[PDB]
Structures are given as structure tokens and as C-alpha cells.
Design an enzyme around this catalytic site. Sequence first.
Site, PDB file in Angstrom:
ATOM      1  N   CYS A  30      28.507  36.747  34.153  1.00  0.00           N
ATOM      2  CA  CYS A  30      29.221  35.473  34.237  1.00  0.00           C
ATOM      3  C   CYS A  30      28.600  34.545  35.300  1.00  0.00           C
ATOM      4  O   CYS A  30      28.643  34.875  36.481  1.00  0.00           O
ATOM      5  CB  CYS A  30      30.666  35.771  34.620  1.00  0.00           C
ATOM      6  N   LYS A  57      41.019  41.294  27.815  1.00  0.00           N
ATOM      7  CA  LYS A  57      41.466  41.199  29.205  1.00  0.00           C
ATOM      8  C   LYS A  57      42.694  42.058  29.445  1.00  0.00           C
ATOM      9  O   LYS A  57      43.531  42.196  28.569  1.00  0.00           O
ATOM     10  CB  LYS A  57      41.790  39.761  29.571  1.00  0.00           C
ATOM     11  N   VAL A  70      37.417  34.507  35.519  1.00  0.00           N
ATOM     12  CA  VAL A  70      36.722  34.901  36.740  1.00  0.00           C
ATOM     13  C   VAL A  70      35.786  33.773  37.174  1.00  0.00           C
ATOM     14  O   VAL A  70      35.391  32.954  36.341  1.00  0.00           O
ATOM     15  CB  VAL A  70      35.967  36.233  36.570  1.00  0.00           C
ATOM     16  N   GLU A  83      38.784  29.425  40.792  1.00  0.00           N
ATOM     17  CA  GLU A  83      37.752  28.387  40.631  1.00  0.00           C
ATOM     18  C   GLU A  83      36.519  28.631  41.518  1.00  0.00           C
ATOM     19  O   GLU A  83      36.606  28.809  42.762  1.00  0.00           O
ATOM     20  CB  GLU A  83      38.277  26.957  40.825  1.00  0.00           C
ATOM     21  N   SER A  84      35.383  28.802  40.843  1.00  0.00           N
ATOM     22  CA  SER A  84      34.162  29.198  41.497  1.00  0.00           C
ATOM     23  C   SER A  84      33.858  28.412  42.736  1.00  0.00           C
ATOM     24  O   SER A  84      33.568  28.997  43.775  1.00  0.00           O
ATOM     25  CB  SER A  84      32.980  29.216  40.515  1.00  0.00           C
TER      26      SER A  84
END
Lengths: 239, 239
Positions: A30, A57, A70, A83-84
Amino acid sequence: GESARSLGKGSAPPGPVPEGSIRIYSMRFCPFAERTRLVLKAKGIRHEVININLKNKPEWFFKKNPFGLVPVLENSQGQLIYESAITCEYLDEAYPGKKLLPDDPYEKACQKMILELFSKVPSLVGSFIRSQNKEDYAGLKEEFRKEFTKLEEVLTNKKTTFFGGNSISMIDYLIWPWFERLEAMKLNECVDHTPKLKLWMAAMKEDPTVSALLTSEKDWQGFLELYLQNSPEACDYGL
Amino acid sequence: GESARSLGKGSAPPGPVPEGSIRIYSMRFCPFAERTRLVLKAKGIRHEVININLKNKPEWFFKKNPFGLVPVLENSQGQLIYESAITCEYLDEAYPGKKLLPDDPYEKACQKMILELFSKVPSLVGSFIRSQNKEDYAGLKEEFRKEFTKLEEVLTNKKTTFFGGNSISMIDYLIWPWFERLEAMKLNECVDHTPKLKLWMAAMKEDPTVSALLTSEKDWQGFLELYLQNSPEACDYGL
Ligand SMILES: *CC(=O)N(CCCNC(=O)C(F)(F)F)c1ccc([N+](=O)[O-])cc1
Ligand SMILES: *CC(=O)N(CCCNC(=O)C(F)(F)F)c1ccc([N+](=O)[O-])cc1
Ligand SMILES: *CC(=O)N(CCCNC(=O)C(F)(F)F)c1ccc([N+](=O)[O-])cc1
Ligand SMILES: *CC(=O)N(CCCNC(=O)C(F)(F)F)c1ccc([N+](=O)[O-])cc1
């Protein structure tokens, strides 16, 4: 290595994060979660990883993040961050070591504006892996070139090795994961008309943190084929 | 009041920002730029305003922001900052007075996650002003309700007057401008099933900074009609 197998539907919700560690809910292929893992590694933060089967999931995962995406961070206090870019910024502020964001307000804002210039690329990479023939491909290449030119202009004015200076920093780690996947996507000819961006990719691959986390073209291809099948085995490709 | 008239195509590029002031390129009816102006007012920052005719832009404006969008900040050092949230964060960090963002990394990340929960609303308001009949309207109302429920859940757990605590702060100012326009858009019945969010709107309108900047329903309606015509006079409605 099998301890990296993902948790899916039916899995038990995990226990508390131990004091002295932070947990990331991730998935090995990811790119959004790779942002956070690059920051964890660059800052030398002790952490554990739970990989989530994104095609199957756990229901409990929606208790970690309502969006079901993720990356998610969870710390020993039980706080949850997702949130990245938010997770990355939190990590930079909350932990010691190399600061990946400038203290200077303007230079920090500049990093964020460069992120905005990049902001169309992740959804393009989405379309790209959807692409069906040589006509779609020619069209996608021109869309990438247009976005890449925006980034090239930044490097042209700054004449720095990286987007934030001569030292690698947050902005580089935030955009890197999509450039990592460019090769395997056969989009490497899009950077031909952007020479500084091409040299930037070479410098990134030399970075110890980047190098440590980089996935081989072959592994990425294995994941992608299963991903495009909606396979419940995609996230665990190679395990 | 006529000094607030917008600069358009053919206008001369402006001179330097004076020391001790910051300039915002804005437009009086633009909710994205209202974010920045709310922050300027809340922090007591001395500033000047240049309104841009967004339907007939000066060519030189693209030298302030390649994207051609307001808001843009320009300071006396000649630095340029754009993207609404970036400008707001820059202002909070760079100027003294009330800090609108928490120092605590987690609580700051929490504000950003609430912004993410709001993130679909601006494009919905876009669709709404496009809406053509009672069927489209019924559909739009349900889309707003779904997004509003996300925000209601936050207030329900926190039981605070505002999204960041009992004191108004950055997150409130960031989401307010779209709620301001809800009335005039006849979307005020969307908050009926979200009682805390409804009380939050009432508290916001009582805030000195919000109140000082609020545009009347009638002025907003005047702008909107001209905006929907692609009128070069829309941005200067009422002047
Ligand atoms: C985790 C992650 O980043 N994503 C979204 C991006 C997916 N696209 C790509 O990897 C790219 F386009 F090739 F860059 C994600 C979301 C969901 C799954 N999944 O297995 O359902 C994988 C990856
Ligand atoms: C932070 C950064 O490197 N930027 C954006 C800063 C504000 N933009 C400008 O100063 C403008 F370009 F003049 F409007 C940046 C982006 C692009 C360049 N460039 O050489 O085109 C310089 C700086
Ligand atoms: C300045 C600004 O925020 N915008 C984009 C949002 C416009 N929509 C609305 O105001 C809403 F939907 F009603 F909320 C903007 C961009 C361009 C113009 N223009 O006059 O060309 C106006 C406003
Ligand atoms: C910052 C904030 O108020 N949030 C998001 C923080 C992380 N989320 C959670 O803790 C989760 F909801 F449990 F996953 C927030 C958002 C929503 C609620 N809520 O009562 O549904 C609480 C806190």
C-alpha cells in the site's frame, strides 16, 4: 517472515499497544501506508506492524478507522490517527530525532504546496493500473507528463537534490511511493522530459530509509495481478 | 467601500507588500478565502486585501499562484503561500496571539482528521448550486445529511461546544464558510437530524470573528446569480 501475514475477516481484535512502541496498521504493498512506514524508519521509531487484508477486512478494523483504510497509527495511550499525511506529520512532531519538516513556517508551507502540486498523481496511478490498451496508455502517459512537469519546475528553481533542500525530508517521503511503482507500471518514460525529477528518483533509491523499504518489481507485479482480481490473497502475496 | 473593487484583466500588477503587513489575494464571496480571512481576524493580524475578479482574472495573478485560485498570501519578504488550509496553518505558526491549533501533536492531528471528515462537503455545495429540480434537491439533501452525521458523531463523543474543544479554534474556522452558505442554499433542513451540529452553527454565529465577516443572505444570493451566469460582475456584487 510469516508473522507479517495479514489479519482478515474473522481475526480477533488485537490487544493494547505496548508502552515504548507505536503500532501501524498497514499493508505491505500500500503506497499510502508506505508513507508512514518511511517516516517511522527515517525517525528511528520503535513500532509494530499489523497488516490488514484490504480485500477481506476484519470488522473490528472499522473501529480503528471508520473509513476502513490504512495507514492507521495506534499508540500505548490508545489514541488513533489516520490519513497518511496526518500520521506522518504526527510522527514528526511527537517523536525525537531528525525533523523531517522544517521549523520555519514558510518553508513548511512550501513543502505542503509541493504536496499539492503532486496531488493528482495517486488517482492517475489508479487509472493507469485500470488502463486497457495502447491508446489508453498513450493518454495516461501525457497526463503523467503534465503532472511531472509541475514537479520539475520546483526542482529547476531550487536546484536542490531533494524537494525540500539538499537533505531528504518529509515531502520526498510523501511522494516517493508512487514513483516507486512507476517502473513496474511501465511509466518510466514519463520522466524523460523531466531530467531533474529523473535524477531525483535515482537519489531517492540511494537513501538508506527508501532502500530498506523498497519492494522488488516482481513482488509488486505479483500483488498487482491479484489485486486486480479482487483476490483475498493479494495482500499476502509472497507469504 | 469602493476600494474593495476587484482587480481584473488589464489591471496593473500590484507593488510590494509593506513591512508590518501581510497581503491576501481574496474574493469577497469565496468560502475558501474566507477561511484565511477568519484566521487573519481571529489572530489580529494587520493585513491588506486585493480582491481578484475570478471570472476575468488578471494575467499577472497567475504569477502569484500558478493554479490561479484564491486565497493567496504574500508577505513583505515576497514569499507566496496558497491553498486555504496551508495559508491558515502558516498564519497560525508565523504570527503571535491566540494559537488556533493545539500544540499537542495528537490533538492537532485530531483537528486534521475532523477536516478530513468534512472533506466531501465543499464539492457537494458545488453540486447543490448546480441542482435543477426538486428531485436533484431531495438527493442532495440526503448526501449532506450523510456527511453531517459524521460531524455530529464527533460532537457527540466530545460533548464540547466546538469541534476542537470549548474554545473556537482552527477546525471551526476551516469548516464554517460552507455552513454559512447553507441557509441561502436552502440546505438548513439538513441539520435537523444533527442537533449538536445545529447548536454549533448557532455558537459560531455568536463568535466575534465569525460575526464580523459574515455576509448577508441577500448579498450572497446576488453574487450567486451572477456567478451562475459567468458574469464578470459577480465578484463585485454590491459595489
Ligand atoms: C493502501 C493503498 O495505498 N491503496 C490505495 C492505492 C492503490 N493503488 C495502487 O497501489 C497504485 F495505484 F498502484 F498505486 C490500496 C487500497 C486498497 C487495496 N486493496 O488491496 O483493496 C490496496 C491498496
Ligand atoms: C514552496 C515552493 O517551492 N514553491 C511554491 C511557493 C510559492 N510559489 C511561488 O513562489 C510562485 F511560483 F512564484 F508562484 C515553488 C513552486 C514552483 C517554483 N517554480 O520555480 O516554478 C518555485 C517555488
Ligand atoms: C473562492 C471559492 O471558494 N470558490 C470555489 C467555491 C465556489 N462555490 C461556492 O461558493 C459554493 F459552492 F457555493 F460554496 C470560487 C471559485 C471561483 C469563483 N468564481 O467567481 O469564478 C467563485 C468562487
Ligand atoms: C480527533 C477526533 O475527534 N476523532 C478522530 C480520532 C480517531 N478516531 C477514533 O478514535 C475512532 F473513532 F474511535 F476511530 C474522533 C472522531 C469520531 C469520534 N466519535 O465519537 O465517533 C471520536 C473522535
